Amino acid sequence: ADVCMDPEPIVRIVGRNGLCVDVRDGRFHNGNAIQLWPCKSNTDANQLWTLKRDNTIRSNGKCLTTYGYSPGVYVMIYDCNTAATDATRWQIWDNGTIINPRSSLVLAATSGNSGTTLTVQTNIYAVSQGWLPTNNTQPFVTTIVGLYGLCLQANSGQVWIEDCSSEQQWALYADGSIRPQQNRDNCLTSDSNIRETVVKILSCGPASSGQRWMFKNDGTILNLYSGLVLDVRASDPSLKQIILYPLHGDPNQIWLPLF
Amino acid sequence: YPIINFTTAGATVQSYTNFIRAVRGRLTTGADVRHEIPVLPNRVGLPINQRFILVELSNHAELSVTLALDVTNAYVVGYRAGNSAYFFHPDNQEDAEAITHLFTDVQNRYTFAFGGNYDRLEQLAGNLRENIELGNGPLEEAISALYYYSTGGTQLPTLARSFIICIQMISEAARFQYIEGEMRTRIRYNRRSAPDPSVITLENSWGRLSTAIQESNQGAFASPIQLQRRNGSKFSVYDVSILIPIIALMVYRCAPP
Ligand SMILES: *[C@@H]1O[C@H](CO)[C@@H](O[C@@H]2O[C@H](CO)[C@@H](O)[C@H](O)[C@H]2NC(C)=O)[C@H](O)[C@H]1NC(C)=O
Ligand SMILES: *[C@@H]1O[C@H](CO)[C@@H](O[C@@H]2O[C@H](CO)[C@@H](O)[C@H](O)[C@H]2NC(C)=O)[C@H](O)[C@H]1NC(C)=O
Ligand SMILES: Nc1ncnc2c([C@@H]3O[C@H](COP(=O)(O)O)[C@@H](O)[C@H]3O)n[nH]c12
Numbered sequence: 081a082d083v084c085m086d087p088e089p090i091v092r093i094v095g096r097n098g099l100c101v102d103v104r105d106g107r108f109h110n111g112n113a114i115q116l117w118p119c120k121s122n123t124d125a126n127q128l129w130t131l132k133r134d135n136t137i138r139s140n141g142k143c144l145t146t147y148g149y150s151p152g153v154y155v156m157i158y159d160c161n162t163a164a165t166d167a168t169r170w171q172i173w174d175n176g177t178i179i180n181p182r183s184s185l186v187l188a189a190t191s192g193n194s195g196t197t198l199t200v201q202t203n204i205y206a207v208s209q210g211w212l213p214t215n216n217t218q219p220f221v222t223t224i225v226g227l228y229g230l231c232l233q234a235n236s237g238q239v240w241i242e243d244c245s246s247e248q249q250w251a252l253y254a255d256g257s258i259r260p261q262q263n264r265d266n267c268l269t270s271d272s273n274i275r276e277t278v279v280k281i282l283s284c285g286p287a288s289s290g291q292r293w294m295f296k297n298d299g300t301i302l303n304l305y306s307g308l309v310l311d312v313r314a315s316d317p318s319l320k321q322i323i324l325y326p327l328h329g330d331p332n333q334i335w336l337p338l339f
Numbered sequence: 340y341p342i343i344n345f346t347t348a349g350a351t352v353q354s355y356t357n358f359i360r361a362v363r364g365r366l367t368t369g370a371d372v373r374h375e376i377p378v379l380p381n382r383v384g385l386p387i388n389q390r391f392i393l394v395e396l397s398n399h400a401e402l403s404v405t406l407a408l409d410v411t412n413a414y415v416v417g418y419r420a421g422n423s424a425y426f427f428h429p430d431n432q433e434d435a436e437a438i439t440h441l442f443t444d445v446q447n448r449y450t451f452a453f454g455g456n457y458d459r460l461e462q463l464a465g466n467l468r469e470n471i472e473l474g475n476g477p478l479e480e481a482i483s484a485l486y487y488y489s490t491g492g493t494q495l496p497t498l499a500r501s502f503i504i505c506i507q508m509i510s511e512a513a514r515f516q517y518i519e520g521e522m523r524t525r526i527r528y529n530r531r532s533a534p535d536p537s538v539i540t541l542e543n544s545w546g547r548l549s550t551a552i553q554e555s556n557q558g559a560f561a562s563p564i565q566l567q568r569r570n571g572s573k574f575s576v577y578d579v580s581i582l583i584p585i586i587a588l589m590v591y592r593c594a595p596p
């Protein structure tokens with residue numbers, strides 16, 4: 081029936097560390113900054129955004145606008161008509177990226193601190209560049225099951241697979257990071273973009289591109305920046321090592337979020 | 340029509356995973372994927388020679404049955420056992436005519452008085468999906484029950500319960516990687532167990548999710564879809580990203596811009 085009629089949902093935009101895209105001090109004068117800020121449970125328009133059909137993201141009637149088309153400029157609120165037309169245009173990608181089609185610069189939060197001003201940076205698929213349109217302020221906690229029915233487990237600085245005893249629970253954040261439920265300021269990290277780097281658990285501090293993942297439709301967990309996927313080294317749970325590796329699709333690269 | 344076959348005989352996690360992979364492959368054509376999820380063919384304009392796929396199940400007892408699935412929705416519409424064929428009461432003129440092209444061989448074609456929807460099936464079975472166990476054992480039993488209904492040795496309540504099993508371990512499995520895994524778990528540990536609230540909920544929400552995703556604004560939903568966790572607690576989905584690893588197939592709802 082008919083061609084798909086897309087809507088214009090009013091939603092929050094969660095990003096780095098689970099903070100929200102926020103219009104500073106609830107004021108809407110042209111130029112006021114957009115910032116990360118603890119998400120609120122209420123209806124303050126300064127934290128709610130409407131995804132218009134024309135590709136503009138609006139809060140309280142104004143447009144999320146970029147100051148310029150250069151890495152480093154800040155994002156501000158601005159009158160949609162007065163502002164440069166294609167400086168209020170953005171695309172929200174399935175892999176959590178919000179891009180300005182014109183400069184190809186991405187919405188970013190170069191800091192995980194409350195109150196940090198939003199800017200547009202060069203796309204490198206970092207955690208500092210992952211967002212999610214949702215009214216859901218809390219991260220998704222699940223069990224990741226893999227090879228031989230074993231579960232992904234974390235024991236401080238390392239991560240490996242082992243038999244599932246119902247912590248092996250993980251929190252999937254809006255910024256695209258996978259964090260161990262018991263210590264939410266720690267990220268499933270991968271030092272390099274090299275064909276075998278052993279994935280570990282370091283602090284989410286840098287919000288690096290090696291700390292951002294995406295669950296694909298084919299059952300793989302992809303590292304957007306490297307193009308590599310979580311892999312249980314040589315299908316041997318014993319080795320206790322999860323590595324980055326090119327996609328081939330065998331049972332040792334397939335996972336499932338069991339919720 | 341294509342024919343995928345599965346046997347509970349030497350049933351294994353790998354054999355089951357290939358089986359489903361085979362079913363998903365025959366349902367979609369790869370031509371239409373949205374937000375990384377394959378969409379099933381549009382019913383309108385689809386020739387009848389590409390309208391159904393035939394799944395053939397066989398068990399230890401050497402008994403065999405062939406289920407027929409409608410490609411536009413992965414719906415089990417009927418089946419064949421021996422020289423007979425049974426169909427669920429079609430719910431619209433078009434479908435009624437379509438099924439006519441299935442199992443043209445058979446000497447005896449019967450059309451049940453009831454439909455294949457879960458409600459009607461649970462009623463007749465005198466059981467809720469929550470009380471009917473799933474697993475390889477239940478699949479074997481269901482195949483037998485299905486086979487003998489043709490000879491006359493299977494009561495209606497049992498027939499219906501058998502259908503609820505096949506529909507879930509095959510159709511619902513093809514539709515959700517989550518549910519396929521659930522079934523894979525049962526086979527792996529030789530467990531017979533009724534589905535959890537999360538499974539029942541995903542089953543009842545396929546249509547809604549297909550719609551929400553397809554007519555979303557860059558993956559954002561206009562209305563949240565509510566789902567359940569294994570323990571029964573609820574949670575709301577507002578975006579498509581979290582579903583990407585959960586739904587494997589979507590029923591066609593509308594055309595892309
Ligand atoms: C993140 O998702 C976007 C979604 O479009 C990807 O970018 C596009 O990828 C398709 C290929 O599937 C290309 O045809 C387009 O030219 C790409 N750009 C745009 C603006 O559409 C992007 O590749 C994804 N990131 C990764 C590394 O997977
Ligand atoms: C997220 O929450 C906000 C506020 O609770 C929802 O916004 C309301 O949406 C309805 C219908 O779309 C509007 O009629 C109201 O005017 C909105 N409230 C406000 C801010 O006045 C929003 O729809 C929710 N997101 C979704 C899609 O569930
Ligand atoms: N015989 C059958 N085959 C496949 N699915 C179903 C069902 C479930 O009920 C749903 C009904 O979907 P629709 O209301 O869009 O027809 C099916 O998509 C499936 O989730 N009932 N009976 C079925």
Ligand SMILES: OC[C@H]1O[C@@H](O[C@H]2[C@H](O)[C@@H](O)[C@H](O)O[C@@H]2CO)[C@H](O)[C@@H](O)[C@H]1O
Nearest residue numbers: 102103104105106117120124126127195
């Ligand atoms: O900037 C942080 C925080 O500001 C809130 O706005 C406050 C503002 O800081 C204060 O000066 C004024 O008197 O009251 C406002 C409402 O309490 C925003 O509401 C909040 O979303 C954050 O944006």
Ligand SMILES: OC[C@H]1O[C@@H](O[C@H]2[C@H](O)[C@@H](O)[C@H](O)O[C@@H]2CO)[C@H](O)[C@@H](O)[C@H]1O
Nearest residue numbers: 276311312313314315323325328330332
């Ligand atoms: O280098 C990791 C790589 O191992 C492959 O498995 C190999 C393994 O290298 C070794 O035990 C020998 O070659 O046989 C195994 C079977 O291929 C995996 O296939 C690959 O996914 C990586 O895990």
